[PDB]
Amino acid sequence: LTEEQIAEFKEAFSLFDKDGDGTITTKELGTVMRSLGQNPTEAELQDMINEVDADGNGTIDFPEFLTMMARKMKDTDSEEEIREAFRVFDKDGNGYISAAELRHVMTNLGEKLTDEEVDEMIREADIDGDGQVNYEEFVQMMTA
């Protein structure tokens, strides 16, 4: 272990834990989000904390925060879930989805994708440029 990595995570934790008691509450997590132009509901803030709150005490402590940072999208079920989220729009079951059909669904549905963000997504998802996305391979690329 080196103090290089310790440095950035501690500082990042402190930007949440502004009261410095060693724990991130929904109020503090929500404050940071609001200061970035976000408008989370308290229910959302609870759900977030509950995904990394090991001991169930309702707030995020430093070990939980480090563990979360390291885990990222490596959760075992992450590919299955993200890929099953794809299947929803794969009407035919091939394991493929057209570019056009992905951009449609990505842009049209909730938490709409920026016309830029979707441009980047398609450029990474359709490696041939034919308009056909093997969404499993795409998910396997996102899921390191």
Binding site: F9, A12, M48, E51, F65, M68, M69, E81
Partner: peptide, 25 residues
């Protein structure tokens, strides 16, 4: 310099957001 710290804060919120959208699906 606060930028690495801020980039880490943004990534952590996107991890939380990802984990919640996974629970909800």
């Amino acid at each position: 310099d606060i930028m690495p710290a801020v980039k880490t804060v943004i990534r952590s919120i996107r991890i939380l957001k990802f984990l919640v959208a996974k629970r909800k699906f």
